[model samples]
Each structure stands twice: as C-alpha cells, then as structure tokens.
Target: GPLGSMAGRPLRIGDQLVLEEDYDETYIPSEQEILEFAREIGIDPIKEPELMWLAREGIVAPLPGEWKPCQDITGDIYYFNFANGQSMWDHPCDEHYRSLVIQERAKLSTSGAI
Candidate 1:
C-alpha cells in the first residue's frame, strides 16, 4: 500500500522526507566536492554509480577487495565489506562531504543499504 494516505487526510508535514522528492537547491553545489574527490582518485564516476556511491560514502582509497573503506584520523583508509560481496573504500578525512551522499541514499544505493 502507499506509505501515506492519499485518499483522505494525506500528509502535510513529512511527505518530503518520505518521498525524498527534493529538499532544496542546496545539494547541487555541495555535490561538487564528490566530483573533485573523484578527480583526485583518477576515478571516472560518471559511468560508475557504484564507485560514485562509495565515494559518497567517504570511500576514497580503493584497493583490491570486496568491502567499503573508511579512513582514520591519520589519513588512512578503511574497508567495509557487505554481505552481498560488494565493497567500498573511504578516507575518513573526507567524511564531512560524505554526509551529503548519506542524505541522498534514495538517489543512489544500487545493490545495498548505505
């Protein structure tokens, strides 16, 4: 069934949150940082939604593995592997920009949850 009732009372407050249609003109400029980071890593994110999603998750230092990577305070990378055998890389120093992706999970997340 529909998440909210369109037949009667409907939604007045949280529809934006539930539908995830759009928030503001705020996220466009903010996403530039992801593009910049992709450039730094020599990764072409245009054709690679998976990699872009990973990058958005703060994954930057990609090595040979089946897990996502997140770094620490010392500019190191950490790998997070999902049960589905997909992985990602992340440099913790760039975590703030990643938060934007976290907010856009619906637009992304091809294979699994963020």
Candidate 2:
C-alpha cells in the first residue's frame, strides 16, 4: 500500500496533537507553499478548494501521494485525492502523502521509532 490506516485523515483534535497528517508530519509542503506553487501556475487560491481544480491540471504536487488540502466555502479545511477521485473530510495525508513514510518506518523501526 502507498499509505497507512489513518492516511486518509487530516487531523485529530484530542487523540490529539496538532499535526499536518503525514507520517512525521513533514513531507507535504505548507499551505502557503502550495499557494506559492499556485501563483507560479498563474493562479492564486481564493480558497483551497480551488486547488481541486488545480490537481486536475496535474500541476499541484502530490502531497501525501494524491490527497491535497482545501478549505470549504465556509473555511473548513479538507482533503481530496485527485488520483483516486475521492474526497476526505478528514486529513488525506495519512494515505498518500506519506508514501515516503512507510519506507522510513522500516528504516526507523528500531533506531527511528525508538
């Protein structure tokens, strides 16, 4: 699998540390970084949902594999995987963005997870 069990979720309020959802929470680019990419692409996000269309153009980076972030019309952040054509109300990074992560799990399992 190119993901983890919770890979499809975006956040956990109480379980419960704040993280961006990728394993180790560092691989995917920042929300602003994504916006930067958007400017270069000749677009700027009015809201993150606009990027859903962006992913369709194949310009957006594959954060956590294919799930990318967004903010609903009222400003609730969410995720969608353009590759799978699916959306997640939870963080999507766990599933795909961490594609690089599982490799680290094996590498870091003893020394790393310790």
Candidate 3:
C-alpha cells in the first residue's frame, strides 16, 4: 500500500475550451418519430388496437415462474426456470406477501386492530 496524498491545481481557461470542444448536438425522439417507428412495426397510430389482435403481441410477455424450454430464432433450445430461487413459492413476492400479511395480523392483535 502507498501512503502519500496527491496534490491538485486550479484549471486554466484552456481547460474550459478543451471541455467545450467535446460538446455535441443533443438528440431526442419526437412523437412523430415514435409514430413512424410504430408504423414501421405495422401498428396503426390512428387506431391503436388491443395487442391480442397484433401478431407481434405473442412474442413479448412477462414470464411467470413456470419452468419451460424456450428457443430463439436460430432454434437453440434452453431451459428457463423463471425464478430467482430465494423463496418457497414460485415468486419472491408470493413468499414475501404471506410473511408480511401474517406479521401485520400479529401486529394488529397486540397493538390494536389495523
């Protein structure tokens, strides 16, 4: 281990000029740009319909904690446990909710009903 402190000096005006040179134009997507993206993806902005009617809807979804095999477009198969494995239930929230609800009940019994 080393045991020496480093020293610093005030920056010169040249330093500010050097930093300003790195600044560039900012870019943010406009509403029209997003509409264009949706259109490219085959979504009509004029009448946005429920995703169930869209073919791409099935491709995206939250995975429930059920073990299953999945394949990518390349056809490589892999198993997904869909769980973090820190709880008795399939989901962390399930185990947490049960414990929290019982703890609340115990608190209510001793400290006036809540």
What TM-score number comes out for model 1? 0.27
lDDT of 2 by residue, 1-114 (tens): 757565665654432222245544335555676666555444435743444344333233435656667555553667766688776775543333233333434464554542
Error of 2 at 36 (Å): 30
lDDT tens readout by residue for model 3, 55-95: 12222222344544444334344444446422121333333
Candidate 3, residue 60: Cα displacement in angstroms equals 20
The per-residue C-alpha lDDT of model 3 at residue 108 equals: 44
Off by over 4 Å in 2: 1-63, 95-114
lDDT of 1 by residue, 31-88 (tens): 6777677555444678655557666545433323333444434444444444564323
Cα error, residue 15 of model 2, in Å, equals 29
Give per-residue lDDT, candidate 2, residue 106.
Answer: 40
Clashes of each: 14, 9, 0
